[PDB]
């Protein structure tokens, strides 16, 4: 008796939170509990949805008396699985103790056993060699009918052990529990608001509660809406009182909540703020100082984003579908990195080269191992599930089979994807970006003729033929690039030198390079066909090779005072160290 | 085994983690080190601090031979522990320390030797030497985090072929007398 706690008795002394919503689920439980056979209900719900809370709600309803007369005198108990198991040394002790309780319970009629996480004891093991033997004592109770046992499980566990074993599923009904809508969630917090304000004497504004639920779902993708929401409010109450020791401010604002979610989110506070107005205007300017050159693309890209993120547009269509074209190995890819960094989203670099083969296309829309793991998920499907609000950086789109393109059509129009696993992903907030490298290949392609003929092709021409016009119809906008500038390439040497010089600062080394040498080195590394792809390698090669030999023992160890300048006759940089 | 010996003496002398643990493989010579440590002490080729020490070795089979009645194992083991703390200079070299983890308690009482010795080790009044294999240490000894915290693991490895020939020459007289034969230096190599 001491193992299991009497929830109904607890309600009299308090500690039972009021139940907001889920009345239909509660009625189903009352309806099924009144059955002669198969009355035992089951709560198939995901973690954090509040399935355990409705069980306590039944105890509150009974003591209150707003239930049928037959159940008015009924009692509910919450089996403490951890208590019995912890005390045991070897199997057989738990079964004996459980048998004693069940007999004591059967003596008194109208006794309900709420076995939270029933799947743990019923089967699937993998805890301490498995505790599947506990199912033995559960089947008689179901068949006997003397007592009604409420169960809490999950969709994954239910199908794995319950649906397979008819003995349990036949004597167990199903009450599907689904996460409540955003509208229902704020109402739930309002019902629980009195407890928190009376706890430490602070008021909660309606603005903050609405902000808490929307921010958590947008950022916290690893927890459900009802449970994680309470933590945000509870964390805010603690943080609000404890942090400002000097000033005790009871009033809370939406900005205060942003800092609370920042800690668990581990993302900058400014990015965490849900300010579409402020972010849209500054996003364009933010991309200018961070990334210099080809600024025209930032202007067109940003204004197009404003049209879709305005809110009027139906979000069934992906937020962004910009299909970049023209030269590659340019700041186009860099822009996405900084765009993902400013927002804080995780950039996913999906390369089609690996998925060129037709069979490999299934990896995106199917479990890659093709095993019975039943938890791997598709590469594209699970990646969107992990980060529903993150951009997908499509790479090497040219080496893609037609079936690969077919999958893209679904997300652009349907906004949902179905795979072998069967898990549904949300593409409302996802962004999509592509890159076309076909143009670069044609530029270096030789011509079969006596004299080579110049081919100054344009980015537009390739997509007309290689890609079906159907894709262009759905496409929102296409950007083009030619080259950044002659001067910017010289500046690219300076930008790399800034990070390279920052490296020297750690070593307490100082180095200077000639302005003329910087220009020539930039030209040597930069190429029209290859763009800036090889520029990174040449920068390090110029100085890393000579400096490495003397850094171990030499003047570089203390101050450096290095001098770098080219030779006119040899066009080779010279290194001199003055400590 | 001069280096391995140093580590044990150092572990015994330090304030905390006084109990060393000679982890190794079967046949490496971990038991000989403990048995050889006492031989070194009587010979006198050890520091003055350890010269006065007296190493003891516990046989679990004899301890469990007559523990038929209730409290027999507890009184015996507890009695022996009292002797160690009063002297303050003795060391109980118990081989196969993993065995005592579940020994001494048939059922109900669950008074295992590991639990009984644990408190005394916390203070550090008694120092002991253990021996276990890698597989046994991880599978059984590592489970008992309390005991592992008190003991300081020592990694032992088979000696080099050069060291082995010296060992054979040192031990050659013992086997030469028993078998009444003379082993050549070329044969041992």
């Amino acid at each position: 008796e001491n193992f299991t706690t009497n929830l109904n008795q607890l309600a009299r002394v308090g500690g039972i939170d009021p139940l907001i919503g889920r009345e239909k689920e509660l009625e189903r439980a009352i309806q099924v509990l009144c059955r002669r056979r198969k009355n035992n209900p089951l709560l198939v719900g995901e973690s954090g949805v509040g399935k355990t809370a409705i069980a306590e709600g039944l105890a509150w309803r009974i003591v209150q008396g707003d239930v049928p007369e037959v159940m008015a005198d009924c009692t509910i108990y919450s089996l403490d699985i951890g208590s019995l198991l912890a005390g045991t040394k070897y199997r057989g002790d738990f079964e004996k103790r459980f048998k004693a309780l069940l007999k004591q319970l059967e003596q008194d009629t109208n006794s309900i056993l709420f076995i939270d996480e029933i799947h743990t004891i019923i089967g699937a093991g993998a805890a301490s060699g498995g505790q599947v033997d506990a199912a033995n004592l559960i089947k008689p109770l179901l068949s006997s009918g003397k007592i009604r046992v409420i169960g809490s499980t999950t969709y994954q566990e239910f199908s794995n052990i319950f649906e397979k074993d008819r003995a349990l599923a036949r004597r167990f009904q199903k009450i599907d529990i689904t996460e409540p809508s955003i509208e229902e969630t704020v109402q739930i917090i309002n019902g629980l608001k009195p407890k928190y304000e009376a706890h430490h004497d602070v008021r909660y504004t309606a603005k903050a509660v609405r902000a808490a639920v929307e921010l958590a779902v947008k950022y916290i993708n690893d927890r459900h809406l009802p449970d994680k929401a309470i933590d945000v409010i509870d964390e805010a109450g603690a943080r609000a009182r404890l942090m400002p020791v000097s000033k005790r401010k009871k009033t809370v604002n939406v900005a205060d909540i942003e800092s609370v979610v920042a800690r668990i989110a581990r993302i900058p506070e400014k990015s965490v703020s849900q300010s579409d107005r402020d972010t849209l205007k500054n996003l364009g300017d933010r991309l200018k100082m961070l990334v210099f050159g080809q600024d025209k693309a930032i202007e067109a890209l940003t204004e197009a984003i404003k049209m879709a993120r305005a809110g009027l547009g139906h979000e069934h269509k992906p937020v962004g579908s910009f299909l970049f074209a023209g030269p590659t190995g340019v700041g186009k890819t860099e822009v996405t990195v900084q765009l993902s960094k400013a927002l804080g989203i995780e950039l996913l670099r999906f390369d089609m080269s690996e998925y060129m083969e037709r069979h490999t296309v299934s990896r995106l829309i199917g479990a890659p191992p093709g095993y019975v793991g039943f938890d791997q998920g598709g590469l594209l499907t699970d990646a969107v599930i992990k980060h529903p609000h993150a951009v997908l950086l499509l790479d090497e789109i040219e080496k893609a089979h037609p079936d690969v393109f077919n999958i893209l059509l679904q997300v652009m129009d349907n906004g949902t994807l179905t795979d072998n696993n069967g898990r549904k992903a949300d593409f409302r907030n996802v962004v999509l970006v592509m890159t076309t490298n076909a143009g670069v290949r044609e530029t270096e392609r030789k011509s079969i003729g006596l004299i080579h003929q110049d081919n100054s092709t344009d980015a537009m021409e390739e997509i007309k033929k290689i890609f079906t016009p159907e894709f262009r119809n759905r496409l929102d906008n296409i950007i083009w690039f030619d080259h950044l500038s002659t001067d910017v390439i010289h500046q690219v040497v300076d930008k790399f030198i800034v990070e390279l010089q920052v490296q020297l600062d750690q070593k307490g080394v100082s180095l200077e390079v000639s302005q003329e040498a910087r220009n020539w080195l930039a030209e040597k590394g930069y190429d029209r066909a290859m763009g800036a792809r090889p520029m990174a390698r040449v920068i390090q090669d110029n100085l890393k090779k000579p400096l490495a030999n003397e850094l171990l023992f030499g003047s570089l160890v203390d101050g450096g005072q290095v001098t770098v300048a080219l030779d006119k006759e040899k066009n080779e940089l010279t290194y001199g160290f003055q400590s | 085994r001069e280096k391995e010996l140093e580590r044990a003496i150092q572990v015994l002398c330090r304030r905390r983690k006084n109990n060393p643990l000679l982890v190794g493989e079967s046949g490496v010579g971990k038991t000989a080190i403990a048995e050889g440590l006492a031989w070194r002490i009587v010979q006198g080729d050890v520091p003055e601090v350890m010269a006065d020490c007296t190493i003891y070795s516990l046989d679990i089979g004899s301890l469990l031979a007559g523990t038929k009645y209730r409290g027999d194992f507890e009184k015996r083991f507890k009695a022996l522990l009292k002797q160690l703390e009063q002297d303050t200079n003795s060391i109980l070299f118990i081989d196969e320390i993993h065995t005592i983890i579940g020994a001494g308690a048939a059922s109900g009482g669950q008074v295992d030797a590991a639990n009984l010795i644990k408190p005394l080790l916390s203070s550090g009044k008694i120092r002991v030497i253990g021996s276990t294999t890698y597989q046994e240490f991880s599978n059984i000894f590592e489970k008992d985090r309390a005991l592992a915290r008190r003991f300081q693991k020592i990694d032992i490895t088979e000696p080099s072929i050069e060291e082995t020939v010296q060992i054979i020459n040192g031990l050659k007289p013992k086997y030469e007398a028993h078998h009444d034969v003379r082993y050549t230096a070329k044969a041992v190599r």
Binding site: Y90, R91 | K68, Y69, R70, A106, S107
Partner: peptide, 11 residues
């Protein structure tokens, strides 16, 4: 499982 237990009689 199937484990053997050794009893202890009272002195």
């Amino acid at each position: 499982e199937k484990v053997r237990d050794a009893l202890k009689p009272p002195s």
